[PDB]
Design a protein around this nucleic acid. Structure first.
Lengths: 7, 51, 51, 24, 512
DNA sequence: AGACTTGTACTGGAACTCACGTGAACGAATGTTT
């Protein structure tokens, strides 16, 4: 679940 | 029959074998239209330019 | 032209009853999609069907 | 060679397009 | 649709004092934020980003109060990222010589996001922290911090120079505090949401992919004139091109308005007469002659069809539909219509029947009234989560090419010998790109090409960025990591070194 | 001497194929009007 700085 | 391209398959930097690429299924299109003069009914040459 | 990853799948010669080729021998070049050539789909609940 | 077309030599003779014909 | 991201950055003196080999946190953090800004700038998702720094000499915040909320400056406010941010990150941001409380940094970030998010529908709200956790601080408000985070539903992420999550007691206390905050906000799942700098770099070294949205296509799957199932189709796989195109601009004025393109037709006579656009009628070629055929007459005689058809011409065994005959430039995924239980049941019945019988459906497809009708194959695709039909076009009679090729098995002069076959067997064995899981369950792919981004866009974005920021230098070379991702693991080459030597020794390859 | 025929090599155009651009058309969301 890539989210945050990576999305 | 006609080869799309003749290429080189490289197993390594030294081993190379020549191959040919063909297409066994190609979409069929209507022949392209050609512009014609309304009056005399003879082809007209087209050109494009920018200024 | 930017490179594209492809796969060569071998093909075995197959002849009909009348001994006429219907599948030539060679390799079949099939293009492999990149990461960006796919698209995301909406989520749909799975509903089963009775036998 | 059997199946060679009588109009364009060197090409396989295409069978007529029959569409969908349901089996028995 | 949009996300507001507040980049909280530490500029304390502790980061500056570090071993040169360790790549002191300042450079790593600057590079990380720069790469994030590039990814967002060249992926226009309309995401707003703001920049706040704690640990600087100056003080500029909405709240001043007493000695608290000091040494913190809001360098950037919420807005669309742009090149100015990249320039400021590169040089404008410099380390300070003070210390600040990262808790106060979180407080100011909360205040800024809450104050600036008004009037805009930001669905997400992320706050990122870049600190060494090496500054003395006191915890006296964590309860209200967590309460506000829960009430406002604000996501929080942390980045530290280290991996665990050889350190001082202050670092241990900071790790404990960040762990407690993350646990309280999310829970057990939140433990892994702390990313070191190197780990973050390993993921932010590639420009974001082109993510277009497919618009649902509604229609009816028809089996005869009595059965009808409501379906929605999406485009699953297609070749992706650049959303924007090069615009030709004048050499000196550098304006698009200053140029104009036009086409003129002139007769083939010596005098080179001029014929206006209304004076030309389209004609075709019929052998050795030319047959005039006006556009209006063609429209009158054109093949007319009733659009938006998804009809089942028939059902056929899967073996009869080969994969080398697929045509077209798209693959469609057909689902049941949204919010329709009956359609879902009907489509599930059809999919399961086809799968059990090992069959596919030959269908007629027309996107709209003016789209040429197509004949294609819909075959089942059942997965644990969802099941759908997959549609791919099939060839007409006109698109088939009848070429005859000489056989290779029966050729006398090209038959390989046994030693050659053994050498090629060794080569194939050595260069395997898949591995069995200890001969236990299944296979694993060593070079998955479906997950590799397209190098064209990466190259284009690199060159565009380099020309924007350095408007004089030539375009750089191709980065090394692109070539690395376009080449297989070094193990394959190491194993293949010797078999290729044998192949060279056995097969007498000579160039003519 | 001269003239035609045959063999080798070269160059330009035809045809075919792919990439890129432009034009027109459309379902869904949003804004405006009653």
């Amino acid at each position: 679940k890539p989210r945050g700085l990576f999305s | 029959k006609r080869a799309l391209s003749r290429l080189k398959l490289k197993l390594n930097k030294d081993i190379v074998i020549s191959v040919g690429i063909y297409n066994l299924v190609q979409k069929a299109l209507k022949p392209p239209p050609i512009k014609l003069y309304r009056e005399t009914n003879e082809p007209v040459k087209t050109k494009t330019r920018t200024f | 032209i930017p490179p594209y990853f492809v796969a060569l799948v071998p093909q075995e010669e197959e002849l009909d009853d009348q001994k006429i080729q219907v599948t030539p021998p060679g390799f079949q070049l099939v293009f492999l999609p990149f990461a960006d050539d796919k698209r995301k789909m909406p989520f749909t609940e799975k509903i089963m069907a009775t036998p | 060679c059997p199946g060679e077309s009588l109009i364009n030599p060197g090409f396989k003779s295409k069978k007529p397009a029959g569409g969908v014909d349901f089996d028995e | 649709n949009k996300a507001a991201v507040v980049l909280c950055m530490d500029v304390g003196f502790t980061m500056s004092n570090s071993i040169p080999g360790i790549e002191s946190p300042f450079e790593q953090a600057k590079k990380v934020i720069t790469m994030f800004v590039q990814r967002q700038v060249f992926a226009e998702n309309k995401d707003e980003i703001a920049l706040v720094l704690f640990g600087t000499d100056g003080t500029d915040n909405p709240l001043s109060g007493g000695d608290q909320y000091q040494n913190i400056t809001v360098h950037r406010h919420l807005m669309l990222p742009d090149f100015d941010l990249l320039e400021d990150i590169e040089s404008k941001i410099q380390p300070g010589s003070q210390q600040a409380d990262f808790l106060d940094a979180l407080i100011v970030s909360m205040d800024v996001i809450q104050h600036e998010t008004i009037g805009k529908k930001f669905e997400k709200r992320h706050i990122e922290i870049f600190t060494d956790l090496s500054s003395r601080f006191s915890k006296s408000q964590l309860d209200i911090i967590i309460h506000s985070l829960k009430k406002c539903d604000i996501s929080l992420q942390f980045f530290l120079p280290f991996s665990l999550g050889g350190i001082t007691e202050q670092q241990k206390e900071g790790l404990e505090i960040v762990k407690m905050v993350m646990i309280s906000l999310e829970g057990e799942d939140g433990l892994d949401e702390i990313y070191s700098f190197s780990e973050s770099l390993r993921k932010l070294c590639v420009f974001k992919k082109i993510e277009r949205h497919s618009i649902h296509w509604p229609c009816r799957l028809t089996i005869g004139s009595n059965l009808s199932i409501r379906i929605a189709a999406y485009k699953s796989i297609l070749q992706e091109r650049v959303k924007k195109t090069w615009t030709v601009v004048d050499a000196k004025t550098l304006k698009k308005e200053d140029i104009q393109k036009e086409t003129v037709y002139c007769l083939n006579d010596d005098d080179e007469t001029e014929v206006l656009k209304e004076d030309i009628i389209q004609g075709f070629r019929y052998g050795s002659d030319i047959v005039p055929f006006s556009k209006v007459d063609e429209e009158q005689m054109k093949y007319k069809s009733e659009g938006k058809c998804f009809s089942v011409l028939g059902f056929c065994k899967s073996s009869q539909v080969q994969r080398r005959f697929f045509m077209g430039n798209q693959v469609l995924k057909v689902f049941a219509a949204r919010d329709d239980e009956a359609a879902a049941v009907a489509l599930s019945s059809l999919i399961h029947a086809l799968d059990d019988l090992d069959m596919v459906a030959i269908v007629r497809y027309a996107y709209d009234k003016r789209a040429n009708p197509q004949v294609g194959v819909a075959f089942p695709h059942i997965k644990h989560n969802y099941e759908c039909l997959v549609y791919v076009q099939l060839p007409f009679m006109e698109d088939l090419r009848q070429y005859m090729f000489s056989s290779l098995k029966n050729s006398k002069k090209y038959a390989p010998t046994e030693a050659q076959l053994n050498a090629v067997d060794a080569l194939i064995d050595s260069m395997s790109l898949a591995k069995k899981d200890e001969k236990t369950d299944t296979l694993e792919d060593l070079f998955p090409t479906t997950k590799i981004p397209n190098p064209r866009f990466q190259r284009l974005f690199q060159c565009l960025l380099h020309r924007a920021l350095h408007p004089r230098e030539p375009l750089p070379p191709i980065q090394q990591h692109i070539w690395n991702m376009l080449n297989p693991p070094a193990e394959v080459t190491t194993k293949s070194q010797i078999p290729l030597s044998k192949i060279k020794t056995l097969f007498p390859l000579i160039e003519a």
